[PDB]
Design a protein around this nucleic acid. Structure first.
Lengths: 93, 271, 46
RNA sequence: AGGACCGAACCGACUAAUGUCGAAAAAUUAGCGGAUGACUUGUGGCUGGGGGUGAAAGGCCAAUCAAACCGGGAGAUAGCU
RNA sequence: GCUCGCCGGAAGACCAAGGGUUCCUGUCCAACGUUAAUCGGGGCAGGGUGAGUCGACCCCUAAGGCGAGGCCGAAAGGCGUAGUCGAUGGGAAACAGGUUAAUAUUCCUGUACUUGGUGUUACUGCGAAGGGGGGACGGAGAAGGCUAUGUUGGCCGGGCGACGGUUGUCCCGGUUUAAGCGUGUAGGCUGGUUUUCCAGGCAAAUCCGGAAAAUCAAGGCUGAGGCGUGAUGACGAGGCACUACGGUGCUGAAGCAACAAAUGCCCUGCUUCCAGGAAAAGCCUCUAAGCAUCAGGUAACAUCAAAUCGUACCCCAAACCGACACAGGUGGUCAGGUAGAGAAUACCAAGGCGCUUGAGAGAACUCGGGUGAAGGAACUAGGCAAAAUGGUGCCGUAACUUCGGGAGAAGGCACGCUGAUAUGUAGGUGAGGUCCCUCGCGGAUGGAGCUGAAAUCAGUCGAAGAUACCAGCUGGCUGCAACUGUUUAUUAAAAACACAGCACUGUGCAAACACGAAAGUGGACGUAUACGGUGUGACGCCUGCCCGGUGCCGGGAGGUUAAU
């Protein structure tokens, strides 16, 4: 019974992109930014309570941030989690 | 088992094949198969102890029931098998119990022979017991040194010992080499010789053989440079020294033996 | 001409790994020597 | 059957020619030897300095080996520049 | 965009390993790029990397490491026992198609399947750090069958030819479909099956082992392939409509037969050979303790899950390695069509590329090439190179000898192409029909067609038909060393090395010895037909003396002399 305490935490963000919209339309699949742990089932229940809707199943992933340099100094973004998250049918917000 | 093969190859010239046309073509008996490691000379530390060692083909194991201590329960051989772990050959027998084991071979040992061990053993070869009850004089082999050590004697191709004397509690025995040694009569041993004695007929002519008989080349010592070996030097093929161990101790003859733990068993040294 | 360096991240580890050094005394006797000098990087496994 | 032959790959380095500030801190061009076996190459692992291993040449050991590298002694010492 | 050139057992595609954002979008040209730059692995920004099934992780070990105890050791600590991890190995199962600029067996469609859990059901002996089995293994050959694959026809659909001809032996393309499932084959192995009993499998066994007795010849097990299902689906030339001149949407015909046949599969097969050829888990049996009413297991149903982590991209390389976008090196997977013995040799296919300065000019001298009159090695240290030869099939072919070889000895023959033989023959293949049988994916049958040498003979062009490439010079005398082998990563490849046997020697196991501060290593899981060391080198003939010296093996009578 994933505790809402950790749960509400887990999610980082919803994301926007062409492919995101494209999954949205062709499949009703939601397109997000979420934590480092962000295990699939975690995400499942998370969005499931957070939109009161009927998740089908998700795809997990790992971004690799770019190692850009910032003036002279070099850096690299800490990585995060998108996910291909869909339902059999749903109303998007 | 002797056949000269025909000199079709420069390099097949002096070969000598050693063919027992009775050796069982096929796979050994699982109940005696055991994993083996190629040491190549190394030690626990890993340093190569014994030299020219290494390579050699994969090579299974056949735990020898040297002890053969099973008494009163008889067995019959079923197959003589070839083992690269020996120069002799191994013979699976079937104890009346049904438990199975290879054994090493007397010469006349063939398929269809029924034996066992024990002090009341028959005197047909292959059986074994201690030489308190083995009659004197008999030519035997496969001999223990201490009671129940298992047997480290005459273990080899066409090996066997003939009794020279039996000393009350004791017995002196003619090693196939020529030293005679007291051994306790309760030390067990197997009657008869060993077959297969023709190994020496093989000449391993191709470099390949010893290669795949697991032999590194061995230097002609002095040929190398002084840099490491006792022998050495020579602005071309010169010794002018003494033959000594590769650590410096004279060879071509030095009495080096000093056990003294057992020398009281050295009745007459080997020549 | 197949020159000196060849790569293996696995072999990096089993070569000079963090666990490697810290498991042996002498290894345990380097981390300071650099921390003494204050290297950014302890070893090469990052 | 063959430590067989001819000869692909593969491994090797015999001859010459560039090339020797070169494209490469050893190449390629013309060739050339082996080409089922002492075959050969990965991946894994083992071996340590007056040590290792070496089908021996004093070889080879992170290009670097008649004693690896690196730290220290130690600013070694220098009837010599 | 056009034309041209180049590769293609790769300069193509896919991977590991490494790379660790470079890929694509958009954007700019400082610098980076060796010229210019509008282009980019270059600057900036955004994006994209989706796994119950593909790896990893995971279960197990493998050679290895570490190491409680301990043993050994100045202290470090050596070492191993229990253990315990450590892939290049083994272990449950996914695919076709579509899908984007950028991924995809993970996304969409459809069809799978596999592994636990959960319960419901009825059946109910299960269960193990342990028993056994299996997993399970070498090399060399050799088929055969199939198949991808490839060829032709049939088919469709397109078309009628830029100049002689070109409505047909016409021309151009296409002529498709997974897993699994059910089939169960060519094939391969296999005696089954029952009862009894037994010092065996560390107890225990009902199992493996064995003994017997019986008792019947069948079953079992394996195993590609092909066939039905798959798959009335999709794909699928093309067509059509729209245009973002880049793709959308719908329709989408035909989509079969035959041939040829793998370095692939049946193959862990078979058959042979000695050099004698991992393990343990996963799996199956078994029972101990224990409980066997419970539990647990059998299975039918139903249900659920099947974490993460990896996942783009690059790769014979501009991204890996060597300081460069590198003429050097880096394994694995695939493997077309043309002649061809052919993974090559040439030249194309899909593909891909045209190597980041260019342009003129045409002396020397180079550097690679080709070309050559007579001469034909006189050149040169040296016939170095170059040249010169080379193939296939046949004839014929020495010295000498370990009888094998040499010996591709040499030397010569001949070779295109068309026709006929014989409008394709030999051969291979096998249609239909005919039957035969326990009915099959059965068999004899017959040869339909089709594929298809080679030879002979005929005829004939050239100068030449091994026409290109590709593709040994050979002789003869010998020194050396028997050679296959090794060798100086980088100036040397042999005679140097090793090597087969041979002898010497040393050594009978807590063996010698080597390392080891000692434990304890390897030897050797061996017991002298064994191993060490040395010397030497196949083989055939042989291998003499000098024991003074110097070492070694022995003998001790006396001189000799420490420590006490």
């Amino acid at each position: 019974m994933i505790r809402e305490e950790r749960l509400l935490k887990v999610l980082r963000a919803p994301h926007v992109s062409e492919k995101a919209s494209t999954a949205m339309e062709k499949s009703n699949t939601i397109v997000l930014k979420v934590a480092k742990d962000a295990t699939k089932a975690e995400i499942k229940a998370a969005v499931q309570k957070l939109f009161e809707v009927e998740v089908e199943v998700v795809n997990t992933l790992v971004v690799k941030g770019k190692v850009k340099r910032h003036g002279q100094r070099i850096g690299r973004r800490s990585d995060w989690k998108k996910a291909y998250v869909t339902l059999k049918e749903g109303q998007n917000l | 088992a002797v056949v000269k093969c025909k000199p079709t190859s420069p390099g097949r010239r002096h070969v000598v094949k050693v063919v027992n046309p009775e050796l069982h073509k096929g796979k050994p008996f699982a109940p005696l198969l055991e994993k083996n490691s190629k040491s190549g000379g190394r030690n626990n530390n890993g340093r190569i102890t014994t030299r020219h060692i290494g390579g050699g083909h994969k090579q299974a194991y056949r735990i020898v029931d040297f002890k053969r201590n099973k008494d009163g329960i008889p067995a019959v051989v079923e197959r003589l098998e070839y083992d690269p772990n020996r120069s002799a050959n191994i013979a699976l027998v079937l104890y009346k119990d049904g438990e199975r084991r290879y054994i090493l071979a007397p010469k006349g040992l063939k398929a269809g022979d029924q034996i066992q061990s024990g002090v009341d053993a028959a005197i047909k070869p292959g059986n074994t017991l201690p030489m308190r009850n083995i009659p004197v004089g008999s030519t035997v082999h496969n001999v223990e040194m201490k009671p129940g050590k298992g047997g480290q004697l005459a273990r080899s191709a066409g090996t066997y010992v003939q009794i020279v004397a039996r000393d009350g509690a004791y017995v002196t025995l003619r090693l196939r080499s020529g030293e005679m040694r007291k051994v306790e009569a309760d030390c067990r041993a197997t009657l008869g010789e060993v077959g297969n004695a023709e190994h020496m007929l093989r000449v391993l002519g191709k470099a390949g053989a010893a290669r795949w008989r697991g032999v590194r080349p061995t230097v002609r010592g002095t040929a190398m440079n002084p840099v490491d070996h006792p022998h050495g030097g020579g602005e071309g093929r010169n010794f002018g020294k003494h033959p000594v161990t590769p650590w410096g101790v004279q060879t071509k003859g030095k009495k080096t033996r000093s056990n003294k733990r057992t020398d009281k068993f050295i009745v007459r040294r080997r020549s | 001409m197949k020159r000196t360096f060849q790569p293996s991240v696995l072999k990096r580890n089993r070569s000079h790994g963090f666990r490697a050094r810290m498991a042996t005394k002498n290894g345990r006797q380097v981390l300071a020597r650099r921390r003494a000098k204050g290297r950014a990087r302890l070893t090469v496994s990052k």
